[PDB]
Design a protein around this ligand. Structure first.
Ligand SMILES: CC(C)(C)[C@@H]1NC(=O)O[C@@H]2CCC[C@H]2OC/C=C/C(F)(F)c2nc3ccccc3nc2O[C@@H]2C[C@@H](C(=O)N[C@]3(C(=O)NS(=O)(=O)C4(C)CC4)C[C@H]3C(F)F)N(C2)C1=O
Ligand SMILES: [Zn+2]
Length: 159
């Protein structure tokens, strides 16, 4: 009934989040751990200090957020306007992406969908290591990922 922190990806650190049936990622920005609604639902984030309710919940945008747990450092938002980005997966893979719009990025080389599965909520990073977006969905054809869809970092604000 809650989301648990089961691991992390060391870049800053991306959180590996899991429910009873699904595992995905969480990215802390502006004091908030952001993730995807299709993974966490409206569930709380659990831990030794007790469950903590989501402070942001947007079903339409597939975006949820909790107050950053103690110790979860926030990543710096990208302000350099880069279009050459890097998707960080739950396996610590860093996949180059060319931004082609406000929420879309093309992959330089198609990757099987199985290799991106479970990395929703992970960050897209600019060449400076700053978070430009948050992995939400993949453009899939013949089971091969050719592009990604992400929540822009600008939408990851407190209010
Ligand atoms: C074909 C496909 C790849 C399955 C699918 N593509 C797709 O739909 O592309 C279209 C065209 C371009 C953008 C997108 O427009 C529709 C928007 C979908 C959405 F994302 F906004 C979304 N909003 C929701 C809001 C509320 C409740 C449920 C929602 N469900 C959604 O979408 C669903 C979920 C999302 C997903 O699987 N994301 C990833 C992932 O890893 N998840 S996960 O960790 O393993 C896991 C399931 C444990 C949590 C990162 C991609 C990985 F697999 F590469 N989906 C389906 C897809 O990506
Ligand atoms: Zn940047």
């Amino acid at each position: 009934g809650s989301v648990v922190i089961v691991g992390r990806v060391v870049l800053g650190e991306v959180q590996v989040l899991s429910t009873a049936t699904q595992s995905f990622l969480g990215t802390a920005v502006n004091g908030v751990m952001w993730s995807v609604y299709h993974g966490a639902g409206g569930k709380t984030i659990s831990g030794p200090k007790g469950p903590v309710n989501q402070m942001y919940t947007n079903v339409d945008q597939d975006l949820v957020g909790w107050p950053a747990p103690p110790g979860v450092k926030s990543l710096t938002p990208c302000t350099c306007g880069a279009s050459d980005l890097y998707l960080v997966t739950r396996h610590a893979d860093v996949v180059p992406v060319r931004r082609r719009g406000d929420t879309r990025g093309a992959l330089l080389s198609p990757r099987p969908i199985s290799t991106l599965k479970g990395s929703s909520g992970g960050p897209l990073l600019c060449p400076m290591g700053h978070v430009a977006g948050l992995f939400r969905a993949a453009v899939c054809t013949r089971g091969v990922a050719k592009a990604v869809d992400f929540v822009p970092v600008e939408s990851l604000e407190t209010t």
